[PDB]
Design a protein around this ligand. Structure first.
Ligand SMILES: [Zn+2]
Lengths: 112, 77, 75, 58
RNA sequence: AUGCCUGAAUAGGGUGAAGCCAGAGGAAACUCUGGUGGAGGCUCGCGAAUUUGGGUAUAGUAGCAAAUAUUCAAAUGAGAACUUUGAAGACUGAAGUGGGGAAAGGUUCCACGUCAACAGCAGUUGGACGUGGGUUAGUCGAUCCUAAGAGAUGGUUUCAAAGGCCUGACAGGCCACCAUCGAAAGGGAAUCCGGUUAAGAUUCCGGAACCUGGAUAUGGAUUCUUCACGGUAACGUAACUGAAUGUGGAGACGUCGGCGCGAGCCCUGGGAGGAGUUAUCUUUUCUUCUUAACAGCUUAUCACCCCGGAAUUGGUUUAUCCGGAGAUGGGGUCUUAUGGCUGGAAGAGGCCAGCACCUUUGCUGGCUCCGGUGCGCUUGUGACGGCCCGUGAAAAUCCACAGGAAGGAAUAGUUUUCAUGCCAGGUCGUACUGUCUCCAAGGUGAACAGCCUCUAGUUGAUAGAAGAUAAGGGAAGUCGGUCCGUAACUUCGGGAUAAGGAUUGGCUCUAAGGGUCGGGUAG
RNA sequence: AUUCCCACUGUCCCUAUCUACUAUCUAGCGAGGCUGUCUGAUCAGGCAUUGCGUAAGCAGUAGAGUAGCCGUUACGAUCUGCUGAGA
RNA sequence: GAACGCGCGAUACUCUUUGAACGCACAUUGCGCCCCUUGGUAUUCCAGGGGGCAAGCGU
């Protein structure tokens, strides 16, 4: 039944400043400003949240190790597993089709 | 603040060149069996943190107290 | 007091939970479970007693329809 | 128990909202009986297609 | 009149659209019935109108200055209706007469002394007068970035010689594109609790902690000498080099609805204290029983992976959506949002009791515990569903990925996104009040409402005296008149097996139904 | 919008009474009952712009019903008496 | 000419902040760069001081 308000300069209900109410060890209710939550990194091909990569603020990534923001597979930390598998399969099939086209062309101008 | 479960780590903390004081705090508290007992907290602050060792055994606390350096200041409670 | 949506939600949740419990326990097979699930979603049963009574009456009628035909033909 | 948003809206925005609702109702009632107020789809339906227009011209 | 950029707001009651589920009629189409669902030019309190801040375009007469209620005793003072204390009466009633902020004001904040003027009576009072005191930041803002737009350079990148970098025992090579201003409500690295003054607090004091930048040292790894491994996989790790060049993520983005979860508040049981009432009754009414940032361990819906191959179609939401483009089922991986335990931390804060004094007069001893609850209010969050629409502002800032340049060993090879250790953080605002804005108890109402009270504030406003009803007629008037008596029902789980006061024993076939041991007379 | 029917009414015959507010002077300046709610409950009171004739207490074996046994604890509206009482 | 201070400018009864006003901005005591020098452990860090910044396919 004790009423609390903002503790900073901004007096408006903006997304920047948001308030939680906590009971301090002094026995009173007090306001506390909450920071914006972090966002999971997303795959660069399909846009789904990357698996096994920590969710932090943009500047909090510079203070953790590489194993907390990467995956041991190729493109790990940038693309998910299915996208990488699709990339591998597509690249191999494209190269095989290029070989087949080159052989067919070598045959078709071999006539003259 | 940090908690440590290692007695020798606490002793190593108290043996460094830049050590000021160690605090020994006593709490009379009950366990799950309902019988009350004496719990001792040994607190020493390192470079940037305060390390606390909690011991629920009286004999171990006595042995650790006897094993503290004689040139180390100890705050009782 | 309690609005219609809350009562309906509680009733449907308890009905579905009971149906799942019966299906896991082996008292109700897959097909009877599916039929009863669709029926309970359609306000066919008003409480647990109605569901149990419908189950047991369905079991009796399934036991009896096979002899029903000759039973009526003989008379 | 009244919600905070309801209290805020009733203290702040109720009067002008009611006034604008009244004005809209009055204008709609006034123009209900007037002739010359039609929607674009209705105007197109009354106009008809091209082929309907050569049919009308003939 | 029409705009644009960045914010706040777009609430509540009622009704009940598509779609879906279960039924009945019909050969379909379809039509009724019940539920569900929660939509709108739906309702309720050529024209007009269409919330809001900041920025930015095209005669000692009239009278008393109007905000209700004051009374008693004491103190000060020359002087008291107005100052102060106590008592009584009354008021605001969380949508305040309560606590804060932006802008604006500029000392109005606090103390001491005073009533010449002012506060339309008075005044010993003061937002007055005179003299002093008071505003403490690495973490809160500005400072940084860009938005609409503004605006230099030669109208906003244009027939401009508009600039930086690299290689090499001056020549060669690479790249394109324009300054700057514009937000104390947008984006943004990091601090909490307790205490403290006459007036200062996320700024001071005590304790505790984070952020950024920098130079460096030690341990460990880099396993034969040269940039590490494991798992089928999702992926895991104490590390585990990476130039030019080319990309990806966060920043970074419409609105609404129900459902699930967390926290604060509200409600509530036991117990340990303190207070009130008690002619009578009342195991009774009020109040204390709190745990900050930060840190370690652990904890997930969703999503993904592996096995497997599904119609007698199953799974499944409050909302009928999903499955050979791989369901049900079985087993795993991940994000740590958010709970739990612990350190911070009981030493703090709170509630009590007792002992010291013409004095800073503080000392001592206890208790600070264990639970329940939800169409409740506030707020955050997850998976969905609906509708509008440029796939829903930009930039500073951080991270990652492809690529393979270059470098690395014999009296300290190379790297140091692993661990520990050292140093520093400037300028301006901060007192006080306050067209836009923040917080928000309970009970009755049993229909938003109104009424009453808790915490907290008031007693301000010159003072004293001295609409309703109605006999008979009835428009003759005027231009116009929720609570007492019934019955059936009715909530969650667990249970299987025909019942649940009795004498319990209860069908056929079909995997297992705790282990073990034991068979005569004669030669 | 107008006209007729019934019912009602201080519109009128025909005015009368009460409350609040106002106006005036003075000191100074100066152009018994009931509804809702609250005192923990009775009793007794406050508020809601009058809000809209048998007291308090005790007793009865009479008393709707709540609560003990298969003649019987207790609570108990209402009723009766003290009581043309009480004020 | 203006602002702030003790006629004058921190040397104040030499010349602060500005102003045609000149490193860039500006309704801010905001933001830089270059050269010398000094101090605090100091080759790196931090700070103070002084002084500054409105070629050609032509002959
Ligand atoms: Zn992907």
């Amino acid at each position: 039944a004790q009423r609390v308000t903002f503790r900073r300069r901004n007096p408006y209900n903006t997304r920047s400043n948001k308030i939680k109410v906590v009971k301090t060890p002094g026995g009173i209710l007090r306001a506390q400003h909450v920071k914006k939550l972090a966002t999971r990194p997303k795959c660069g091909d399909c846009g789904s949240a990357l698996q096994g990569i920590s969710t932090l603020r943009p500047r909090q990534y510079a203070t953790v190790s590489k194993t907390h923001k990467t995956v041991s597979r190729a493109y790990g930390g940038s693309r998910c597993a299915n996208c990488v598998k699709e990339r591998i399969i597509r690249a191999f099939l494209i190269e095989e089709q290029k070989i087949v086209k080159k052989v067919v062309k070598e045959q078709t101008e071999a006539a003259k | 603040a940090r908690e440590i479960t290692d007695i020798k780590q606490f002793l190593e903390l108290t043996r460094r060149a830049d050590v000021k004081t160690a605090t020994v705090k006593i709490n009379k508290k009950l366990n799950k069996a309902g019988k009350p007992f004496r719990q001792t907290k040994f607190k020493v602050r390192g470079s940037s943190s305060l390390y606390t060792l909690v011991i629920n055994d009286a004999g171990k606390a006595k042995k650790l107290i006897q094993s503290l350096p004689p040139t180390l200041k100890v705050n009782r409670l | 007091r309690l609005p219609s949506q809350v009562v309906w939600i509680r009733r449907l949740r308890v009905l579905r939970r009971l149906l799942a419990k019966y299906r896991d326990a082996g008292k109700i097979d897959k097909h009877l479970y599916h039929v009863l699930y669709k029926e309970s979603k359609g306000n066919a049963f008003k409480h647990k007693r109605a569901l149990v009574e419908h189950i047991i009456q369905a079991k009796a009628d399934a036991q009896r329809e096979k002899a029903l035909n000759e039973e009526a033909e003989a008379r | 128990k009244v919600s905070k948003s309801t209290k805020k809206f009733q203290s702040k925005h109720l009067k002008h909202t009611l006034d604008q609702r009244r004005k809209e109702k009055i204008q709609k009632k006034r123009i209900q009986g007037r002739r010359g107020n039609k929607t674009d789809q209705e105007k197109a339906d009354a106009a008809g297609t091209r082929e309907q227009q050569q049919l009308k011209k003939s």
